[PDB]
Enzyme design. Sequence first.
Site, PDB file in Angstrom:
ATOM      1  CE  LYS E  10      46.507  43.518  39.967  1.00 18.21           C
ATOM      2  NZ  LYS E  10      46.440  44.448  38.794  1.00 18.21           N
ATOM      3  CE1 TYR E  50      40.837  42.755  38.016  1.00 15.61           C
ATOM      4  CE2 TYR E  50      41.237  40.424  37.628  1.00 15.61           C
ATOM      5  CZ  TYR E  50      41.657  41.651  38.112  1.00 15.61           C
ATOM      6  OH  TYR E  50      42.899  41.777  38.700  1.00 15.61           O
ATOM      7  CG  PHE E  58      41.917  45.096  28.883  1.00 12.87           C
ATOM      8  CD1 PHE E  58      41.665  44.755  30.202  1.00 12.87           C
ATOM      9  CD2 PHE E  58      41.505  46.342  28.429  1.00 12.87           C
ATOM     10  CE1 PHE E  58      41.008  45.629  31.050  1.00 12.87           C
ATOM     11  CE2 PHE E  58      40.845  47.223  29.276  1.00 12.87           C
ATOM     12  CZ  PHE E  58      40.602  46.863  30.588  1.00 12.87           C
ATOM     13  NE  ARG E  86      40.665  54.461  44.173  1.00 15.67           N
ATOM     14  CZ  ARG E  86      39.900  55.266  43.443  1.00 15.67           C
ATOM     15  NH1 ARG E  86      38.803  55.795  43.969  1.00 15.67           N
ATOM     16  NH2 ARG E  86      40.233  55.544  42.192  1.00 15.67           N
ATOM     17  CB  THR E  92      45.804  52.143  37.106  1.00 16.05           C
ATOM     18  OG1 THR E  92      44.666  52.085  37.976  1.00 16.05           O
ATOM     19  CG2 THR E  92      45.820  50.914  36.209  1.00 16.05           C
ATOM     20  NE  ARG E 103      48.872  49.308  41.209  1.00 13.19           N
ATOM     21  CZ  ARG E 103      47.557  49.473  41.209  1.00 13.19           C
ATOM     22  NH1 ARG E 103      47.045  50.695  41.090  1.00 13.19           N
ATOM     23  NH2 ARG E 103      46.756  48.428  41.330  1.00 13.19           N
ATOM     24  CB  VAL E 110      49.525  49.436  33.238  1.00 12.20           C
ATOM     25  CG1 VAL E 110      49.521  49.026  31.772  1.00 12.20           C
ATOM     26  CG2 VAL E 110      48.124  49.377  33.823  1.00 12.20           C
ATOM     27  CG  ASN E 113      49.159  47.030  38.356  1.00 10.67           C
ATOM     28  OD1 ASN E 113      48.836  45.862  38.573  1.00 10.67           O
ATOM     29  ND2 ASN E 113      48.269  47.978  38.071  1.00 10.67           N
ATOM     30  CG  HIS E 116      42.584  44.339  43.038  1.00 10.17           C
ATOM     31  ND1 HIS E 116      41.847  44.894  42.016  1.00 10.17           N
ATOM     32  CD2 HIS E 116      41.736  44.220  44.090  1.00 10.17           C
ATOM     33  CE1 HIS E 116      40.606  45.096  42.426  1.00 10.17           C
ATOM     34  NE2 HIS E 116      40.513  44.699  43.684  1.00 10.17           N
ATOM     35  CD  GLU E 127      37.067  44.258  44.530  1.00 11.64           C
ATOM     36  OE1 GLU E 127      37.922  44.625  45.364  1.00 11.64           O
ATOM     37  OE2 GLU E 127      36.929  44.806  43.415  1.00 11.64           O
TER      38      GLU E 127
END
Lengths: 149, 149, 149, 149, 150, 149
Positions: E10, E50, E58, E86, E92, E103, E110, E113, E116, E127
């Site tokens: 990110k 998303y 949000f 994961r 998360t 993380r 959050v 973080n 992804h 994806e």
Amino acid sequence: PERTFIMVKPDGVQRGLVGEVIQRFERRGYKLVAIKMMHASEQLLQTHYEALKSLSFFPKLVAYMSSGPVVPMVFEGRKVVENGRTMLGATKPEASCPGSIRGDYCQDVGRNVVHGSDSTESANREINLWFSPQELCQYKQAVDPWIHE
Amino acid sequence: PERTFIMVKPDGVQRGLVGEVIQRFERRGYKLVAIKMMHASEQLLQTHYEALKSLSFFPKLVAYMSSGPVVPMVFEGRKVVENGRTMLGATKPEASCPGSIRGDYCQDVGRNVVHGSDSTESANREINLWFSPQELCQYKQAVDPWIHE
Amino acid sequence: PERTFIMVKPDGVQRGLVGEVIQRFERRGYKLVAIKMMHASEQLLQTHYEALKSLSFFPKLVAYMSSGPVVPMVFEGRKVVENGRTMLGATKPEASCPGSIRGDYCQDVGRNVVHGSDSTESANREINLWFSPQELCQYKQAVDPWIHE
Amino acid sequence: PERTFIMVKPDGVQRGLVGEVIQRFERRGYKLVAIKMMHASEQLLQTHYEALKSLSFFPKLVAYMSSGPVVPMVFEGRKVVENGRTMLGATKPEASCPGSIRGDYCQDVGRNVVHGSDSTESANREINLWFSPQELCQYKQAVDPWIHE
Amino acid sequence: GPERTFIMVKPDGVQRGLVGEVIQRFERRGYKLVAIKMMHASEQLLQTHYEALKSLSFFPKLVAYMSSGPVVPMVFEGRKVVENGRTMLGATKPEASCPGSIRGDYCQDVGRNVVHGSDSTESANREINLWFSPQELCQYKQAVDPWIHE
Amino acid sequence: PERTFIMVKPDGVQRGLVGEVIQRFERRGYKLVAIKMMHASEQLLQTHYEALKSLSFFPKLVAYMSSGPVVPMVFEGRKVVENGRTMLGATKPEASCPGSIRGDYCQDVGRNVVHGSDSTESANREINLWFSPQELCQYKQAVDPWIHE
């Protein structure tokens, strides 16, 4: 403006783990705002551990914690108190997960390298017990927009 | 016992390299005997850098070194002054070997993360400028028989 | 704005060293501005290595560099070209200093993990061969005031 | 099939650096082919240091090298003898580059953590002294095509 | 083909110099990097990425943040790479993340973080196809393959 | 004293993880007291895995564990058996926590890099199966007062 009190114990100093402890907080983006190395007096240690004063091991703990230099310090950042507890690991090292400080480096509860505040109220008391307001340094972290929302 | 003065500069604090600097000395068996975080006054900085007054752009240096907190510290051990210089790397990061602090982390001589004493005479002078005698801690390293002969 | 071309060779990909190469540049504060993974064609490799056609065994070089994916990338920052060369280490790994990429990971000049531009002229030429101008990303580094003056 | 002899000295065992030494060689693609921990008799150490047996520091050297366990081992790969010398660093740590074992961890030539063969002739002698042929293991390294040309 | 997952650094991971760290976490577990690029993601692309969040309060703030700086999408291949990915990223919320996860080691918030990762094989394949064309995905035979799986 | 048996499996040797496994125990203050690299015989491995001898996968496991060299070793210290299990992580890597050896490096239960004793009784049997008494070394750890209370 959350802050927590972290202190490297005499065994952490002897084993050369002071930088390791600091780096774990720095890499999570937390700001170091105070630090010093000192021989802690008996009275200071009794006040620091005042919630334990009625316990049988209190005098042994106070004597051990004055048997070598300690390194108190203060970190600042979002959820630093609760995350600091997770980063240190369980008090018992054999209950600590790998990747925590005590899970990586420690074998005995009585030699678990580092102290951290267990609550916001404890943190505020411990910070002011070990550091005068003049020893708390203030600066604007450049990466602030990328560590907090 | 030989001692040297090491100080993380404001860019080292901002970039989260305090623990890294400390760990490089602990790794080599050197004893941390003093440390603090502070905002250095202009008068302290001007005395500390007295020798550089014969070079250009002295106010720029003073302003840089007072633009954020610094972390002075003292390490003890055999040949710690000369080895401390090698561990920090050449003053100019372009001339620094990888594995040294400046070779690993720095791009600019004006933002070179850390200071270290260049001689025994300079180390004694710098330690006394930044630390009072009561601030230096004394302890016996357990691994002493295994780090020097 | 100085930029250099870095490319992980097929042996660097096989041995899982892509992240290690990138992290050596990131930790020195350099900005990643382009990256991709691809199978390089013979025509691209012949132009990339145009200067080595005067040396023996050119088809062997083209075949090796075609034997698996490569990861070209672009880093931006002050003195990134000359520091990039030092960070990679001498072309021959046995002449490389410990702490450099080839000094830490390589045994054979023919399997030396990574390429880097030898000059700004070469860097500009190599960036244009491998990336369209539309692939270079532009952003302002938060720590910029602390990595250079 | 080039091989070199590397031995962690009693101070490297005490300081918990056995894994670090081994990893320096593994990450450069070198093959571990033999290893053991032992208490070397004075007689065995006198044979290993046969060249120094008439010198004044000889009893001190033998007492130190028998004052704790050692970890002899053998590594295999191209240029492993010369590269092993560079990876260990200069015998005197104060002349060692950062990123070498002695440059990262040692203060004293008398406590320099690890031994390595200085030549192909010495390596063959030392391997055959410390190990029998049956203790040398043979396997085909899967990454072989990516470390050798 | 073998199992693949989509991992993306990110904008805060790029700014903080953590791209190489994320990649190395997967490489050291024997996973194969098969695609990677750095790009400025459009709001259109991010809204599709998303799309399962489009009804939530949000969503506009998330799309705007994720376009405020470059990102590094990538693809890794190997046994159980989606589930293990994961776990390696951690929860998360960073305060619920174990030390040793990405993380848990590097993050406080959050909304910042760092990385992804796909939450399922269905999501992973959607994806991967959204961010990469088939030509951008590279194939090679890992030398250590007989020693990373049976 | 408490001891546990740790063995790097053939895939851990191939992947260059022998030193990493050792350092995980050394950094927690555990003493290495025996180590060797060897080609394990079919009979040795059948006895080592005797609790599994009635299970369907037993021949395939025995065959695989003799397909390359292994590195058995012994570590000593407080709670080393239970802590060793935690440091290695769950048998199936997908159930292993990040920070454990299997959580950091493994994808497949059949290629999970390292073995460790599951109990005190298993450790004593495994140590005596793989090591003759002359291969077990003992020494007084200098940092003992700072790791044990």
